Design a binder for this molecule. Structure first.
Ligand SMILES: O=c1[nH]nc(-c2ccc(Cl)c(C(F)(F)F)c2)o1
Ligand SMILES: *[C@@H]1O[C@H](CO)[C@@H](O)[C@H](O)[C@H]1NC(C)=O
Length: 348
């Protein structure tokens, strides 16, 4: 099944990096007032030189010219209840990541700019075009995303909520699901995300949520790309999915996997730090695994924390947003200290 169909944005001034129109893939569900808008991930680029390289060998992530007419919805984007126990009947939207700006950019290609970085405007334009295609009737809009798209959820969920309020749709409940986008600005074990993001925000004209921007102020907006710093400033409900030993986190930390004491302590400390940042995140799913992304993989149902799968936790979250619920938990953070100490971790 290739059940999500491409729509290029009617406002062709909202573009991918190379000026081609951005777009979205849509699979409507007439019987449903639930809308899932998923933000693709795929790292970023932050200067002319590294964006040029990405354009050579990651061009679907900077351009729509080669996109296919359809995509198959998988995992949380699947319409089969066997694969997606959580929201199989929802209206499904996959928003391709073609702005290389962690979904933060608001800059057009111009005399001054070789590339457009319009991630934040792509999201707003998708939302506004979908209102004419049924989203106006929605009860819940779940903005989800993986990796850079998960960070994009944190950066954009409150803006989507404000956009819908200002457009006259205050009944649509906007919520966020951030998968594998909750990173730590920690010491490396041996370019670095904080500096690259600082440079990126400038290169992209990047924007961050207002309350977080007001806390950190000019020149320090890079702080708002880090979940534990931006999450407390957000008003929309956000469910956080994060492997405790995320492969992308380890990569930026210069860890490449007998492990000797120094690295053992480094890895154990990373897990404990991640766990600590989630202590006050009531809706979260954080298994003790070495992996990356979870929600659009076809076998996303297999992992469990304390005996509860992610589709179940998300269903429990839905119920909680109608006192904790008997046997239907929403805060699921592993406490064991080493990758794969949870037997349900992905096998690779
Ligand atoms: O697609 C991917 N894989 N790994 C990332 C990633 C890793 C670390 C950091 Cl700090 C960030 C952020 F938060 F600013 F973008 C993103 O993004
Ligand atoms: C197209 O998008 C741009 C950027 O968001 C916006 O300024 C402009 O008003 C939009 N045009 C139309 C006709 O919607």
């Amino acid at each position: 099944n290739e059940d999500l169909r491409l729509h290029l944005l009617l406002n062709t001034s909202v573009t991918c990096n190379d000026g081609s129109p951005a777009g979205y893939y849509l699979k409507e569900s007439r019987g449903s007032r639930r809308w899932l808008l998923f933000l693709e991930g795929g790292w970023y680029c932050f200067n002319r030189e590294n964006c040029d390289s990405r354009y050579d060998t990651m061009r679907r992530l900077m351009s729509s010219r080669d996109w296919p007419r359809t995509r198959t919805g998988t995992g949380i984007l699947s319409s089969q209840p066997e694969e997606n126990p959580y929201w199989w009947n929802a209206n499904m939207v996959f928003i391709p990541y073609c702005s290389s700006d962690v979904w933060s950019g608001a800059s057009s290609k111009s005399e001054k700019n070789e590339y457009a970085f319009m991630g934040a405007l792509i999201i707003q334009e998708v939302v506004r075009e979908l209102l004419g295609r049924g989203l106006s009737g929605a009860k819940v809009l779940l903005l989800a995303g993986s990796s850079a798209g998960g960070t994009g959820v944190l950066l954009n969920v409150d803006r989507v909520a404000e956009q819908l309020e200002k457009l006259g749709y205050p009944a649509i409940q906007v919520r966020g699901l951030a998968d594998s986008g909750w990173f730590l600005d920690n010491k490396q074990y041996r370019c670095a995300p904080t500096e690259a993001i600082r440079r990126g925000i400038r290169y992209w004209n990047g924007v961050v949520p207002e309350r977080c921007r007001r806390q950190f102020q000019e020149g320090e907006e890079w702080n708002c790309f880090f979940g534990y710093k931006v999450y407390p400033t957000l008003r929309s409900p956000v469910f956080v999915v994060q492997w405790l030993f995320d492969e992308a986190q380890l990569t930026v930390d210069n860890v490449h996997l007998p492990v000797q004491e120094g690295l053992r302590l480094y890895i154990q400390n990373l897990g404990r730090e991640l766990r600590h940042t989630l202590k006050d995140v009531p809706a979260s799913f954080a298994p003790a695994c070495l992996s990356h992304e979870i929600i659009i993989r076809s076998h996303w149902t297999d992992v469990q924390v304390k005996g509860t799968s992610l589709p179940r936790a998300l269903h429990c979250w839905d119920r909680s947003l109608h006192t904790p619920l008997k046997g239907c938990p929403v805060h699921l953070v592993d406490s064991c200290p080493w990758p794969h100490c949870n037997p349900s971790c992905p096998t690779g």
